[PDB]
Design a protein around this ligand. Structure first.
Ligand SMILES: O=C(O)C(C(=O)O)[C@@H]1CCC[C@H]1C(=O)c1ccc(-c2nnn[nH]2)cc1
Ligand SMILES: O=C(O)C(C(=O)O)[C@@H]1CCC[C@H]1C(=O)c1ccc(-c2nnn[nH]2)cc1
Lengths: 227, 226
C-alpha cells in the first residue's frame, strides 16, 4: 500500500481537523495523492463535518466517512443519544484499507483524543493504528497543561508500539506569551514538532491556506512520508 | 506508617486543591489525623498558596512544602524563569515519608497532572508515588474531553504499578447538562467515583465546607483509608 497516518490529538478542540487539512494541502502541493477519512464523526446536528472542512480548506476530494452522530459528544454517548450503535472495529479498518494505495497519503482523523472509544468494546484509534500499521501524528496545543497531556498521549502510543510521527501545534499565537514559548521549547524535547500552525489558520481562504500549509511543514519530511 | 495518597489530576485547574481539602475535612471528621504536602507550588506572585487554602477550608495544621515559584507556569518553567532549580527527588520522597505515621492520612498534592516534572531530573509525582508506595486519587472534570484524559492518566498509573484509589469530580455543575451527566456515568465505568464536589465549593467558609465534605464522600470508604 501507501502511507497511512492516524491524526490524533491530546483532546477535542485542539486542532485535529485544521492540521489534517494543512498536511493534506502540503502533501498535495508536493504532488502526493491524499485521502482523508473520519471514521467516526459526532456533532453533525451542530454542523460539525470535518471531512467537508478539509475539502474546503485543502481541496481534498478523496474524503471517506463511516459513522455520523448528531450530538457534539463523545462517540459512545452520541451513539447512545441517537439510539444508534458504534461501528465495529473491522468496519473502521475496512474503510481505511479501501483507501490505501501506493504513492498515496491516507490521513485517518480521530474523534477527540487517542483513547476515545470508537468501537465496542473500548476499541480506540490506537487499536486501529495497530491494525493498519499506521504511525500517529499528535496534535497538541501551546496552552497551559499541554506537556502533561502530550506525554500521556505519547506513552499510550508507545504501550502498543504505535510509532509517533511527530507533534503539530494546532494554534500558535502571535505574539507568543511566556507560557506558549516555554511549551514549544519543551514539546520539541519530547518529540519532533512538525509544524505550528498560525492561530486563525482555519479562517484562511483556499489560496492563503495553501501558502500557510506549504510554509508550515518541512518539505523534506512531507515528501519523505510517501515513496 | 499510615496511609499515603498522592492526589493528582488530569491536568491543571481541575480542582486538585479543593479535593485535597474536601478529603482532608471528611477524614478529620471521621477522627483521622490528616497531613497535606504540596512539595512544589507555582503561581505565588498572584497569591496561589494551596496549603493555605487547605488549612482554611479543612483546618489541617500539618501542611508541608519545599518550594514556591512566583510565575504561574509548570514547575520546570517557573524554576527556569526564576533562575533556580526544582527541589531534589530525595527531598520530596523523604519529606513525605517523614510526614507519614500510623493513624495518619497523608495527602500529597501534585502540580498540574501526573507526568509533570516536580524534581530534577524529570522526576514526576508518579515516580514519587512508586518511591513512597502510595496509591493515587485522580481529580477529573465533568466536562467534554474528561474521559480521554482520565483513561490516559489511569493507563500511566498502571504502567508503573501505582494503584488507583478512585476518581473525584472536582466541580459538579448546576444544572449538570447532558454532557456532564453522560460523563459522570462513563467515569464510573472506568473507576470508582468517590465524590463529585458541587461547583463553587472552594468559596465556602470552613463550617459550610466541612458539611459539604462529610456528605460528599462515603463515610465507610474514608474510614477504611487508614
Ligand atoms: O495545577 C496546579 O497545581 C496549579 C495550582 O497550584 O493551583 C498551578 C497554578 C499556577 C500553574 C499551576 C501548575 O502548577 C501547572 C501549570 C501547568 C502545568 C503543565 N503541565 N503540562 N503543561 N503545563 C503543570 C502545572
Ligand atoms: O474532537 C473532535 O473530533 C470533534 C470534531 O469532530 O472535530 C468533535 C466535535 C463534536 C464533539 C468532538 C468529539 O468527537 C469528541 C468530544 C469529546 C470526546 C471526549 N473524550 N473524552 N471525553 N469526552 C471525544 C470526542
Amino acid at each position: 500500500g501507501g502511507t497511512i497516518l492516524v491524526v490524533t490529538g491530546t483532546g477535542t478542540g485542539v486542532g485535529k481537523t485544521v492540521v489534517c487539512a494543512a498536511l493534506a494541502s502540503a502533501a498535495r502541493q508536493a504532488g502526493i495523492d491524499v485521502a482523508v477519512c473520519k471514521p467516526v464523526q459526532t456533532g453533525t446536528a451542530r454542523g460539525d463535518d470535518d471531512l467537508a472542512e478539509v475539502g474546503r480548506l485543502a481541496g481534498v476530494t478523496q474524503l471517506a466517512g463511516l459513522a455520523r452522530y448528531p450530538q457534539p459528544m463523545a462517540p459512545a454517548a452520541a451513539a447512545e443519544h441517537a439510539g444508534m450503535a458504534l461501528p465495529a472495529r473491522d468496519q473502521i479498518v475496512r474503510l481505511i484499507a479501501d483507501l490505501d494505495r501506493p504513492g498515496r497519503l491516507t490521513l485517518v482523523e480521530g474523534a477527540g483524543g487517542l483513547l476515545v472509544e470508537l468501537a465496542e468494546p473500548g476499541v480506540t484509534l490506537r487499536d486501529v493504528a495497530v491494525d493498519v500499521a499506521a504511525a500517529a501524528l499528535v496534535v497538541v496545543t501551546a496552552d497551559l497543561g499541554t506537556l502533561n497531556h502530550t506525554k500521556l498521549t505519547l506513552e499510550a502510543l508507545a504501550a502498543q508500539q504505535v510509532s509517533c510521527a511527530g507533534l503539530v501545534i494546532g494554534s500558535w499565537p502571535d505574539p507568543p506569551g511566556l507560557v506558549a514559548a516555554s511549551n514549544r521549547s519543551a514539546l520539541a524535547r519530547i518529540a519532533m514538532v512538525r509544524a505550528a500552525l498560525p492561530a486563525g489558520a482555519a479562517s484562511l481562504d483556499a489560496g492563503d491556506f495553501a501558502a500557510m500549509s506549504a510554509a508550515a511543514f518541512d518539505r523534506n519530511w512531507v515528501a519523505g512520508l510517501v515513496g
